[PDB]
Amino acid sequence: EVQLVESGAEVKKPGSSVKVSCKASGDTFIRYSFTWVRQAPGQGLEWMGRIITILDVAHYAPHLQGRVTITADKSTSTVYLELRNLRSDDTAVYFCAGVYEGEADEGEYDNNGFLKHWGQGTLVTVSSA
Amino acid sequence: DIVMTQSPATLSVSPGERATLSCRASESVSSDLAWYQQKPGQAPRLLIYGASTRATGVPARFSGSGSGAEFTLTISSLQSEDFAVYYCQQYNNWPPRYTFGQGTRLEIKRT
Amino acid sequence: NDSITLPCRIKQIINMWQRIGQAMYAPPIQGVIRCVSNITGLILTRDGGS
Ligand SMILES: *[C@@H]1O[C@H](CO)[C@@H](O[C@@H]2O[C@H](CO)[C@@H](O[C@@H]3O[C@H](CO[C@H]4O[C@H](CO)[C@@H](O)[C@H](O)[C@@H]4O)[C@@H](O)[C@H](O[C@H]4O[C@H](CO)[C@@H](O)[C@H](O)[C@@H]4O[C@H]4O[C@H](CO)[C@@H](O)[C@H](O)[C@@H]4O)[C@@H]3O)[C@H](O)[C@H]2NC(C)=O)[C@H](O)[C@H]1NC(C)=O
Ligand SMILES: CNCc1ccc2c(c1)C[C@H](CNC(=N)N)[C@H]2NC(=O)C(=O)Nc1ccc(Cl)c(F)c1
Ligand SMILES: *[C@@H]1O[C@H](CO)[C@@H](O)[C@H](O)[C@H]1NC(C)=O
């Protein structure tokens, strides 16, 4: 399997733009997909969007679309999320998740949707103070 | 808009007993559903994928089934560490527009 | 009258033959897939030597 370490929690002033990381380690990096999902304190889970490495293409959420940006880097084996126009209503915990896909490098691929491994979940506080 | 709803709003049941949960869809979602339990403040865990099979490295006392717009998960005999909130989630549509369920609270049936 | 066998896989990320690109497709269908033909020609290439 792999392990997904995250960054350190953060506080951001409103009306800003936030970036957050997540590093994976343990296996060949391309062969896994990735997804970002967040949760407000004691609530449901907000599926944000996913990304395919081997093709490096990301899909986003409808009502989140516009101020979101996922990205990756095969060299350093990491994944970055960025979100734009920070508003206090988005303080929450965030998680990077993945799943094995198959022999991508040889042209095999199945495009699973569910989420096998999980990270801890950083925390982001957007607020006045 | 495809929407799921968990049922019931809360289940409660005592040890040695079975728990039953049912997820509800809005159209036909053939075999794309998944179940995760979350102990409060912890990384969730994969229980059922494909809406018909069990994960690897997981106790065999869980099992779900269903189709169409009605799905369910049951565990025949609770134990001491099965106290977490449970979520269903679908991944059927393409282009990908995935969505998560509500989540239901599960504590012992005890006074 | 024995035969020959070959290890045929089914892929999902291919280099288009129409252009310079790359494509994806869904995973394979559920069921039995058969295919009958008879090769009637082929393409070779020499090797620079003496
Ligand atoms: C060189 O030239 C040859 C000659 O054509 C060519 O071979 C042909 O290949 C095709 C595809 O490889 C074969 O077509 C398949 O044939 C089967 C057999 O059907 C029988 O029953 C029908 C009923 O009407 C009869 O008419 C027929 O004569 C056969 O007896 C079909 O069943 C296939 O259709 C299925 O596959 C499609 C794939 O998408 C499905 O969309 C379609 O709906 C059918 O699917 C159903 O069954 C699936 C099976 O899993 C199931 O999953 C689905 O859910 C659904 O239920 C298909 O038409 C054709 O028979 C071959 N001809 C031969 C062998 O003489 C070579 O392909 C060609 N060379 C190259 C390189 O292409
Ligand atoms: C000396 N070599 C010359 C040479 C080498 C390789 C190639 C060309 C020429 C053309 C083409 C390059 N352009 C491109 N790739 N977009 C590339 N061929 C292909 O991509 C190709 O055949 N794909 C393909 C896919 C699926 C099926 Cl079923 C199939 F029958 C074929
Ligand atoms: C080769 O197979 C095709 C399809 O079955 C058939 O039509 C053809 O007649 C075969 N070869 C010849 C030239 O007989």
Mutate to test the pocket of ligand 1, among C8, C30, C36, C39 (most ligand atoms within 8 A of CB): C36
Instruction: Give how many domains chain A has, as a whole number.
Output: 1
* Sequence-separated contacts (24+) of A56-61 with Cβ below 8 Å: A59/B95, A59/B96, A61/B97
- Ligand 1 atom nearest the C-alpha of C35 is 12
> What distances in angstroms separate CA A75 from CA A29, A35, A53, A79, A108, one per listed residue?
9, 19, 12, 11, 22
Domain encompassing residue B20: 5-107
- A95 alpha-carbon distance from chain centroid: 6
Instruction: Give how many domains chain B has, as a whole number.
Output: 1
Residues 6+ apart with CB under 8 A from A45: A37, A38, A39, B87, B89, B100, B103
> What distances in angstroms separate CA B6 from CA A44, B27, B36, B83, one per listed residue?
11, 15, 13, 17
DSSP string, C28-41: PPSS----------
* Experiment used for this model: cryo-EM
Considering only CB atoms, A107 lies closest to which of C12, C26, C27, namely C12
Distance between CA atoms of residues A81 and A36, nearest Å: 8
Task: Name the residue with the closest Cα to ligand 2, atom 23.
Answer: C17
Distance between CA atoms of residues C10 and C17, nearest Å: 17
Structural resolution in Å: 3.9
Determine if ligand 2 sits within 6 Å of the CB of residue C19: yes
Q: Kindly report the CATH number assigned to the domain that includes residue B89.
A: 2.60.40.10
Domain encompassing residue A57: 3-126
Q: Kindly report the CATH number assigned to the domain that includes residue A30.
A: 2.60.40.10
Give the residue from chain C lying closest to A103, CA to CA: C11
Say whether C24 sits in a helix, a strand or coil: strand
E-assigned strand segments in chain B: 5-7, 10-12, 19-24, 34-38, 45-49, 53-54, 62-67, 70-75, 85-90, 99-100, 105-107
Structure tokens at A35: 């997804």
CB contact, 8 Å: B49 with chain A?
yes
Residues 6+ apart with CB under 8 A from B34: A113, A114, A115, B46, B47, B48, B49, B51, B88, B89, B90, B91
Distance between CA atoms of residues B61 and A45, nearest Å: 25
E-assigned strand segments in B4-43: 5-7, 10-12, 19-24, 34-38
